[PDB]
Structure 1
Amino acid sequence: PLTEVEQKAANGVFDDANVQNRTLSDWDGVWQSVYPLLQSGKLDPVFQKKADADKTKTFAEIKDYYHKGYATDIEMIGIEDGIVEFHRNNETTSCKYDYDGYKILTYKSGKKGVRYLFECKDPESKAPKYIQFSDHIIAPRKSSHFHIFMGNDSQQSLLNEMENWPTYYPYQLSSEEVVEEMMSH
């Protein structure tokens, strides 16, 4: 169900002229952090396969890399009617985020990605001032999973973040299915 342009953009290959703005509604739904799967051992098959297929890397290096990447105490995210909710252990923050457009990034690998930028302008909210979505999509399309960046300093600080990228799949997916997607999608 992917066009050549979408399929290549998914793999970090695209012309900048094909990148288009999106809206918050692309990430509407209830979403679950993948971090507990890593911690329980349920992602081990993912790292096992990757380590096997790549002769220059080991299981421990791969798992540690995703441990840094996935680490977060934000267990779920809900997005509905313009509001993003961050669920921690019993505690919950939210904001009606403003869209701020996107930024195209060229990574050290020469692959490319796009960050979709939002800002909380509610002086009453306790949610992060700036957030960014990255999900291998460069034009309007409902997301099937996403990486999110959050902070209070600047958008540019987040643009540089490459170590920690808390990651979220639809909360209705079983663990097997989240594993299958990480192996396949």
Structure 2
Amino acid sequence: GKLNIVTTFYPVYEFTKQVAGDTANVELLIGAGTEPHEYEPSAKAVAKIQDADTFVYENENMETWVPKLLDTLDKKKVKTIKATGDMLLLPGGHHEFDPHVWLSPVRAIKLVEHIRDSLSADYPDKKETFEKNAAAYIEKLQSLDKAYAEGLSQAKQKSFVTQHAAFNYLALDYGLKQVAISGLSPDAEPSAARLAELTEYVKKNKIAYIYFEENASQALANTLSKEAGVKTDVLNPLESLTEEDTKAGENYISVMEKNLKALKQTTDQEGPAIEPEKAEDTKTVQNGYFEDAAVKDRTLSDYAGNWQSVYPFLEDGTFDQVFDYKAKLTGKMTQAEYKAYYTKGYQTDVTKINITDNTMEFVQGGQSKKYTYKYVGKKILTYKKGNRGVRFLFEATDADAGQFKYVQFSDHNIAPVKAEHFHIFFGGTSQETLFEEMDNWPTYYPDNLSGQEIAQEMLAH
């Protein structure tokens, strides 16, 4: 009969139904009346998932209860699908990363593609149906992407204030700037103190709208207008669709069309950029802001382990999303320019480095050269930005060390601690010549990681 597919919340349900069509009965586990971020599965819910043919969830950074279920699910017959597939995430403002990729139409295409791919692998006899259904829905998503680009590319004012911070990927992919606001709910009146803070914030930044995940209550809208001097509207994160909206034919695409209209009320109006209510402090040791007194000698054992070059994962495309993000975050280089920059940086024929308390072993061409190393000191460099970094210096004790005679590690630390990754400068001339090297910095992560894991780790912090 039809596949019994259990999905978690609304966009996972919709995207899965679009791909599976009449091959499946697709169930929505989290009903519209429950906020998906707050959902916790009951024993009955877990049973329903365990007994399904296929279970689809969006991402462990959204359905934070899914990781604990997978250890047992992996032993049951149900085939699981993580909708985001190999999509890399950025940190949010428990879970490490912001899951809200489906509010970017171009990313929604990638989730639909991945659901197609996984269902096609899981049920090969239906692959032509999945592929056909997916392609037709992707056509509609492509038109949505075009509407987004056309409606946002000429934005005069790129920043928008949202009570639900679901729109950072939309912002990155279409040239806007999400400004999340805290301590607000569509159905609740703020405290006197919070309202005063909001009134000052609106005035300081000339904020025209506060956007909410659903319509603000009549009372809250009135209060924000008469006391805080700001209008309200809806930026719907498409996490829930009411039965009323379902029966009126609303869906992901129509919600996103409404979101575009709502955004443009802000983005097509002149005005100053809106600052976050509380400012960031990026001046940290790992970002290169530290005091001389905290810089300490280190031993080779901080770097002990087995380490793999990241260069093959640039070459094979695994890091293409990293360079896409960098371009969208800074605007300073294009994606291709960033990839070229990191090609020069990562290029090396040293595929692996094994490090002990006293030795380093360098693998080139499937053969290894191993030397004993002594610590020789450290060097604090200052960069254009005004931040600094510490190189920790080692020298091989073998006459035959060649290009590995001199070795310097950079790992964003300044004192004893186990490295999580490093950039390594090595040569056979002197330490001083390596201090001037700024273009090539072969980069290593633990051998126990996949390239995909390295790529996601690069975006963390």
TM-score normalised by L of structure 2: 0.38
CA distance in 1, matches of 2:291, 2:401: 37
Partners of 1:122 and 1:57 in 2: CA distance: 42
**Counterpart in the other structure of 2:334:** 58
Alignment partners' CA distance in 2, 1:56 and 1:107: 17
1:74 to 350, 354, 357: 350
Aligned partner (choices 14, 34, 37) of residue 313 of structure 2: 37
Say whether 1:163 aligns with 2:439: yes
Tell me how far apart the structure 2 counterparts of residues 124 and 57 of structure 1 sit (CA, whole Å): 41
1:111-158 deviation per Cα after TM superposition (whole angstroms, max 9, x unaligned): 200000000122254561100000000011000000000011110100
Contact 2:403 2:427 in 1 (8 A): no
Amino acid corresponding to residue 162 of structure 1 in structure 2: M
Q: Higher strand fraction: Structure 1 or Structure 2?
A: 1
Q: CA deviation at 1:110?
A: 1.7
Unaligned runs of 5+ in 1: 1-6
Find the partner of 1:94 among 352, 360, 370: 370
Amino acid at match of 1:129: K
Partner of 2:457 in structure 1?
Answer: 181
Matched, 1:17 2:293: yes
Hey, what's the Cα distance between the residues in 2 that align with 1:47 and 1:126? 34
Describe the SS at the equivalent of 2:369.
strand
Partner of residue 4, structure 1: none
Determine if contact 1:95/1:127 at 8 Å carries over to the other structure. Answer: no
* Residue in structure 2 matched with residue 130 of structure 1 by the alignment: 406
Distance 1:57 1:84 in 2: 36
C-alpha RMSD over aligned residues? 1.3
- The equivalent residue for 1:143 is 419
* Identity in percent: 52
Q: Give the distance between the partners of 1:41 and 1:29, measured in 2 at CA.
A: 26
Are the counterparts in 1 of residues 308 and 447 from structure 2 also a CA contact under 8 Å?
A: yes
Question: What amino acid sits opposite 1:31 in the alignment?
Answer: W
Post-superposition shift, 1:9?
1.1
Q: 1 CA distance for matches of 2:403 and 2:426?
A: 9
CA shift for structure 1 position 80: 1.6
Runs of 4+ in 1 over 3 A off after TM superposition: 124-127
Partners of 1:153 and 1:20 in 2: how far apart? 25
More helix, by proportion: 2
Contact 2:313 2:319 (8 Å CA) reproduced? yes
Instruction: Provide closer, same or farther for how the CA distance between residues 58 and 124 of structure 1 changes in structure 2, counting only shifts above 3 A.
Output: closer
Q: Which has the higher contact order (CA 8 A, sep 6+)?
A: 1
- Residues 66-99 of structure 1 show CA distances to partners (whole Å, capped at 9, x for unaligned) of 0000000000000124110000112211111010
Q: How many residues align?
A: 179
The residue correspondences of 1:95-110 to structure 2 (distance < 5 A) are 95-110=371-386
Query: Which of the numbers 382, 390, 393 marks the counterpart of 1:114?
Result: 390
- Aligned partners of 2:409 and 2:423 also within 8 Å: yes
User: How far is 1:174 from its partner?
Assistant: 1.5
Contact 1:86 1:127 in 2 (8 A): no
**Residue 404 of structure 2 aligns to a residue in which SS?**
coil
Q: Partner of 2:417: helix, strand, or coil?
A: coil
Where structure 2 has 5 or more consecutive residues not aligned to the other structure, the ranges are 1-282
Q: Deviations over 1:29-77 (max 9, x none)?
A: 0000000000000000100111111123210111000000000000000
Residues of 1 paired with 2:400 and 2:430: CA distance?
A: 19
CA distance in 2, matches of 1:66, 1:28: 25
3-state SS of paired residue (1:94): strand
Give 1:108 shift. 2.1
Q: Relative to 1, partners in 2 of residues 1:118 and 1:131: Cα closer, same or farther, differing over 3 Å?
A: same
Q: How many Å separate the matches in 2 of 1:125 and 1:167? A: 20
Q: Which residue of 1 aligns with 2:277?
A: none
**Secondary structure of 1:8's match?**
coil
TM-score by length of 1: 0.93
Match of 2:298, SS state, is: coil
